[PDB]
Design an enzyme around this catalytic site. Structure first.
Site, PDB file in Angstrom:
ATOM      1  N   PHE A  54       1.121   9.206   3.547  1.00 10.98           N
ATOM      2  CA  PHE A  54       1.983   9.232   4.471  1.00 10.98           C
ATOM      3  C   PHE A  54       2.809   7.797   4.691  1.00 10.98           C
ATOM      4  O   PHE A  54       2.055   6.929   5.300  1.00 10.98           O
ATOM      5  CB  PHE A  54       1.193   9.661   5.813  1.00 10.98           C
ATOM      6  CG  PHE A  54       0.516  10.719   5.904  1.00 10.98           C
ATOM      7  CD1 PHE A  54       1.350  12.253   5.979  1.00 10.98           C
ATOM      8  CD2 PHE A  54      -0.679  11.146   5.927  1.00 10.98           C
ATOM      9  CE1 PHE A  54       0.768  13.096   5.673  1.00 10.98           C
ATOM     10  CE2 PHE A  54      -1.386  12.390   5.942  1.00 10.98           C
ATOM     11  CZ  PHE A  54      -0.373  13.637   5.768  1.00 10.98           C
ATOM     12  N   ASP A 105      -8.909  10.478  11.661  1.00 14.95           N
ATOM     13  CA  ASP A 105      -9.211  10.033  10.652  1.00 14.95           C
ATOM     14  C   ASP A 105      -9.639   8.607  10.415  1.00 14.95           C
ATOM     15  O   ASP A 105      -9.149   7.714   9.690  1.00 14.95           O
ATOM     16  CB  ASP A 105      -7.838  10.056   9.825  1.00 14.95           C
ATOM     17  CG  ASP A 105      -7.762   9.876   8.368  1.00 14.95           C
ATOM     18  OD1 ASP A 105      -8.783  10.056   7.547  1.00 14.95           O
ATOM     19  OD2 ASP A 105      -6.617   9.185   7.845  1.00 14.95           O
ATOM     20  N   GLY A 158       0.841  -1.179  -0.067  1.00 19.70           N
ATOM     21  CA  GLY A 158       0.124  -0.175   0.107  1.00 19.70           C
ATOM     22  C   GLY A 158       0.699   1.224   0.024  1.00 19.70           C
ATOM     23  O   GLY A 158       1.952   1.121   0.498  1.00 19.70           O
ATOM     24  N   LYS A 159       0.523   2.204  -0.776  1.00 20.98           N
ATOM     25  CA  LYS A 159       1.293   3.598  -0.887  1.00 20.98           C
ATOM     26  C   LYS A 159       0.469   4.670  -0.330  1.00 20.98           C
ATOM     27  O   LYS A 159      -0.905   4.580  -0.598  1.00 20.98           O
ATOM     28  CB  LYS A 159       1.759   3.855  -2.231  1.00 20.98           C
ATOM     29  CG  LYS A 159       2.686   2.913  -2.619  1.00 20.98           C
ATOM     30  CD  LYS A 159       3.403   3.344  -4.009  1.00 20.98           C
ATOM     31  CE  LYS A 159       2.397   3.251  -5.169  1.00 20.98           C
ATOM     32  NZ  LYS A 159       2.970   3.543  -6.549  1.00 20.98           N
ATOM     33  N   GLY A 160       0.448   5.450   0.506  1.00 21.80           N
ATOM     34  CA  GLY A 160      -0.469   6.480   0.865  1.00 21.80           C
ATOM     35  C   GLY A 160       0.316   7.784   0.902  1.00 21.80           C
ATOM     36  O   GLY A 160       1.244   8.036   0.440  1.00 21.80           O
ATOM     37  N   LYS A 204       5.809  -0.076   7.799  1.00 21.78           N
ATOM     38  CA  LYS A 204       5.466   1.483   7.021  1.00 21.78           C
ATOM     39  C   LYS A 204       6.867   2.265   7.060  1.00 21.78           C
ATOM     40  O   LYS A 204       7.424   2.178   7.872  1.00 21.78           O
ATOM     41  CB  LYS A 204       4.429   2.215   7.883  1.00 21.78           C
ATOM     42  CG  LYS A 204       3.999   3.618   7.134  1.00 21.78           C
ATOM     43  CD  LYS A 204       2.907   4.248   8.216  1.00 21.78           C
ATOM     44  CE  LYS A 204       1.385   3.541   8.141  1.00 21.78           C
ATOM     45  NZ  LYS A 204       0.712   4.322   8.704  1.00 21.78           N
ATOM     46  N   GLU A 253       4.806   4.249   3.089  1.00 21.16           N
ATOM     47  CA  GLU A 253       4.554   2.999   1.987  1.00 21.16           C
ATOM     48  C   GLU A 253       4.446   1.903   2.927  1.00 21.16           C
ATOM     49  O   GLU A 253       5.405   1.591   3.865  1.00 21.16           O
ATOM     50  CB  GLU A 253       5.632   3.026   1.206  1.00 21.16           C
ATOM     51  CG  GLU A 253       5.189   1.890   0.260  1.00 21.16           C
ATOM     52  CD  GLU A 253       6.158   1.957  -1.259  1.00 21.16           C
ATOM     53  OE1 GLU A 253       7.100   2.805  -1.231  1.00 21.16           O
ATOM     54  OE2 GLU A 253       6.100   0.986  -2.129  1.00 21.16           O
TER      55      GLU A 253
HETATM   56  N1  LIG Z   1      -4.955  -3.223   0.793  1.00 25.04           N
HETATM   57  C1  LIG Z   1      -4.018  -2.776   1.863  1.00 25.04           C
HETATM   58  C2  LIG Z   1      -4.788  -3.036   2.961  1.00 25.04           C
HETATM   59  C3  LIG Z   1      -4.398  -2.725   4.395  1.00 25.04           C
HETATM   60  C4  LIG Z   1      -2.985  -2.525   4.346  1.00 25.04           C
HETATM   61  N2  LIG Z   1      -2.346  -2.078   5.630  1.00 25.04           N
HETATM   62  C5  LIG Z   1      -1.945  -0.994   6.019  1.00 25.04           C
HETATM   63  C6  LIG Z   1      -1.682  -0.507   7.217  1.00 25.04           C
HETATM   64  C7  LIG Z   1      -1.191  -1.473   8.127  1.00 25.04           C
HETATM   65  O1  LIG Z   1      -0.705  -1.313   9.269  1.00 25.04           O
HETATM   66  C8  LIG Z   1      -1.540  -3.013   7.935  1.00 25.04           C
HETATM   67  C9  LIG Z   1      -1.239  -3.946   8.536  1.00 25.04           C
HETATM   68  N3  LIG Z   1      -0.541  -3.518   9.814  1.00 25.04           N
HETATM   69  N4  LIG Z   1      -1.485  -5.095   8.331  1.00 25.04           N
HETATM   70  C10 LIG Z   1      -1.922  -5.599   6.945  1.00 25.04           C
HETATM   71  N5  LIG Z   1      -2.389  -4.496   6.241  1.00 25.04           N
HETATM   72  C11 LIG Z   1      -2.016  -3.287   6.404  1.00 25.04           C
HETATM   73  C12 LIG Z   1      -1.875  -2.444   3.532  1.00 25.04           C
HETATM   74  C13 LIG Z   1      -2.784  -2.619   2.011  1.00 25.04           C
END
Ligand SMILES: Nc1ccc(-n2ccc(=O)c3c(N)ncnc32)cc1
Length: 303
Positions: A18, A135, A14-16, A34, A20
């Site tokens: 804040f 949020d 996931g990229k956001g 992260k 990655e």
């Molecule tokens: N699609 C998607 C959905 C959720 C996440 N994601 C985001 C932040 C987290 O902290 C996290 C975690 N701890 N465990 C599993 N997934 C996580 C990434 C991609």
């Protein structure tokens, strides 16, 4: 440091705005990492600070492992390591699956329990300050293997100093996801010096998340398709003005289907939603009251 040097990153998930998020392996276990660049040190540090709050740990709050730094020989990465949840977000889970009445109650009660713990001040030497998320949304809640939720993405949170009734970072601007902003945040009437106002704004957002869960509750094969709140009234990635026109001016909320009155669990959920959605934040239910109501429902259902 000693933790990052022993972690192998396996996949960027996931990229956001804040950092990655990566899936990594630490001591043979999957972890979430992260990663922030050197120019995002303020966001990394603030998120590490919130996750290190005394007595924060709870089954319904993402388990934090450590902050760390990794130098690959060219640049430094700033890391936040946490528990990994294979199902990912509640948004992903609700798009992929429908849930039973038991499943819906488990997701809603666990979210409320996590939010009630975040909001709770614990007085004492190892005291915990009350924290408001700012949020909350289905994309920021994760689903554990056992079908319960944990609140994550605490980086925008604010903490209360109860003795002086002040907020640790003295917020002076709107933050968060526009679709989930409470009416008072959209019209900028919120008193940002009043910590209780941030707790009330989180409850509005939780009500929206409960609506997302209830749509996916399948009874006798009947359920709604997955949608974000306000899917019927605003575009994708809506602006503050788009949201304000709908939530504040036209005073609309997500539709509550008539059939949710035909099932006791859905009737309880719909009543909670309405009581999270009041325009006046002071009239909204508290997370502890929602936890109590849903706990009474879970007991009745035999979960
Ligand atoms: N699609 C998607 C959905 C959720 C996440 N994601 C985001 C932040 C987290 O902290 C996290 C975690 N701890 N465990 C599993 N997934 C996580 C990434 C991609």
């Amino acid at each position: 440091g000693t933790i990052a040097r022993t972690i192998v990153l396996q996949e960027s998930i996931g990229k956001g705005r804040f950092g990655e998020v990566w899936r990594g392996k630490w001591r043979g276990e999957e972890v979430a990492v992260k990663i922030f660049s050197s120019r995002e040190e303020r966001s990394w540090f603030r998120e590490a600070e919130i996750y290190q709050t005394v007595m924060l740990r709870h089954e319904n709050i993402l388990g934090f492992i450590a902050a760390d730094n990794k130098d690959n020989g060219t640049w430094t990465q700033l890391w936040l390591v946490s528990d990994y949840h294979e199902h990912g977000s509640l948004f992903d889970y609700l798009n992929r699956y429908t849930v039973t009445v038991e499943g819906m109650i488990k997701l809603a009660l666990s979210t409320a329990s996590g939010l009630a713990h975040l909001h709770m001040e614990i007085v004492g030497t190892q005291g915990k300050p009350a924290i408001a998320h700012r949020d909350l949304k289905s994309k920021n809640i994760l689903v554990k293997k056992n079908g319960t939720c944990c609140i994550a993405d605490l980086g925008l949170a604010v903490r209360h100093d109860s003795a002086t009734d002040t907020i640790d970072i003295a917020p002076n601007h709107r933050v968060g996801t526009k679709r989930y902003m409470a009416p008072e945040v959209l019209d900028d009437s919120i008193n940002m010096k009043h910590f209780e106002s941030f707790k009330r704004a989180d409850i509005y957002a939780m009500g929206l998340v409960f609506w997302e869960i209830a749509r996916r509750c399948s009874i006798g094969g009947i359920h709604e398709d997955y949608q974000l709140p306000y899917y019927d009234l605003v575009p994708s990635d809506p602006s503050v003005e788009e949201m304000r026109k709908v939530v504040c001016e036209q005073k609309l909320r997500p539709n509550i289907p008539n059939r949710w009155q035909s099932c006791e669990a859905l009737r309880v959920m719909a009543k909670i939603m309405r009581e999270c959605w009041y325009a006046n934040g002071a009239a909204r239910l508290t997370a502890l009251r929602i936890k109590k109501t849903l706990s009474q429902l879970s007991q009745q259902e035999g979960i």
